[PDB]
Amino acid sequence: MPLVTFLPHEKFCPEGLTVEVKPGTNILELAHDHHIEMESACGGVKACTTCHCIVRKGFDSLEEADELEEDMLDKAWGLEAQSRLGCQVFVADEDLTIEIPKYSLNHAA
Amino acid sequence: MPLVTFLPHEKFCPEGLTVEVKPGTNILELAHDHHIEMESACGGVKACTTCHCIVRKGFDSLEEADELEEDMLDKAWGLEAQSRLGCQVFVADEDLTIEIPKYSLNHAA
Numbered sequence: 001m002p003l004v005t006f007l008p009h010e011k012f013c014p015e016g017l018t019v020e021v022k023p024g025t026n027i028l029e030l031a032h033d034h035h036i037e038m039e040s041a042c043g044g045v046k047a048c049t050t051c052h053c054i055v056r057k058g059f060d061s062l063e064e065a066d067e068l069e070e071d072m073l074d075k076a077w078g079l080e081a082q083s084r085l086g087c088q089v090f091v092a093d094e095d096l097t098i099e100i101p102k103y104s105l106n107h108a109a
Numbered sequence: 110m111p112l113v114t115f116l117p118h119e120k121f122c123p124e125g126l127t128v129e130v131k132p133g134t135n136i137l138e139l140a141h142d143h144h145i146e147m148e149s150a151c152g153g154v155k156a157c158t159t160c161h162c163i164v165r166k167g168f169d170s171l172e173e174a175d176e177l178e179e180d181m182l183d184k185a186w187g188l189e190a191q192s193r194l195g196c197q198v199f200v201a202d203e204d205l206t207i208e209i210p211k212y213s214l215n216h217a218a
């Protein structure tokens with residue numbers, strides 16, 4: 001059973017979180033299940049950047065981002081080679097380590 | 110009568126805004142009066158960074174930031190010499206030009 005690790009984040013998960021999950025688990029859904037309140041402005045349909053995360057371990061196990069996701073990621077703060085939209089990340093067969101970025105696009109409540 | 114200029118921002122004010130205002134006008138209040146929906150998470154009491162702005166013209170006309178404001182600004186994305194918390198900016202006797210930052214601390218809705 002793959003482990004997902006959320007790295008510590010001052011706002012969303014100060015102590016971090018490590019959890020065993022089934023293959024096919026959605027990262028955004030998992031975060032919300034554990035009250036890691038990652039924003040999901042567009043409702044998880046690859047139309048914002050608020051669920052931006054960086055998959056620092058296990059990125060290469062994941063299904064490749066589609067064009068819609070890649071186009072949104074081009075707009076994100078702090079884009080990296082392992083950036084993903086959290087709403088589109090589904091755990092496969094390997095452990096993942098997820099960093100939630102410190103910064104994001106400034107937007108209205 | 111001083112002019113306040115908000116520089117164009119993709120999310121908050123795509124075309125920018127220039128308005129004549131009375132001395133003593135609060136920048137956050139003014140922005141909201143013109144549906145420039147700058148976030149004000151703490152309710153305008155110098156306890157967050159969501160109203161962060163950069164006063165690119167007229168900064169030196171303003172009352173100096175107090176210690177509470179300076180301590181919050183130390184936490185803001187993209188801190189500059191002319192950074193202020195918008196909720197604490199009151200127009201004095203000179204025109205102001207205000208830039209709303211592109212990025213901010215990533216936080217929950």
Ligand code: FES
Pocket residue numbers: 039040041042043044045046047048049050051052072085086087088
């Ligand atoms: S919640 Fe908008 S792209 Fe993920």
Ligand code: FES
Pocket residue numbers: 148149150151152153154155156157158159160161181194195196197
């Ligand atoms: S609204 Fe929180 S410091 Fe200005």
Ligand SMILES: [Cl-]
Pocket residue numbers: 049050052075076077103104105
């Ligand atoms: Cl972003």
Ligand SMILES: [Cl-]
Pocket residue numbers: 158159161184185186212213214
């Ligand atoms: Cl900020």
Ligand code: NA
Pocket residue numbers: 106107108109147148159213
């Ligand atoms: Na904001």
Ligand code: NA
Pocket residue numbers: 038039050104215216217218
């Ligand atoms: Na956010």
